[PDB]
């Protein structure tokens with residue numbers, strides 16, 4: 198039913214209170230995300246760093262975790 202996507206990932210600051218995702222880690226820099234930080238979430242239910250994922254996607258338009266084709270690309 199409802200659908201809508203411009204062509205970019207949702208930007209939000211991690212929350213040490215509400216663990217949106219049971220497990221939150223960055224496969225790019227094998228480092229966890231901190232609160233009040235610009236993070237991103239792949240369309241495959243994966244958390245990443247607005248900076249890391251930005252460097253990865255550039256090289257490979259896919260998920261470095263589940264090699265799940267993300268889809269759209271900023272550049």
Ligand SMILES: [Zn+2]
Nearest residue numbers: 223226246249
């Ligand atoms: Zn990272």
Ligand SMILES: [Zn+2]
Nearest residue numbers: 241243260263
């Ligand atoms: Zn993934």
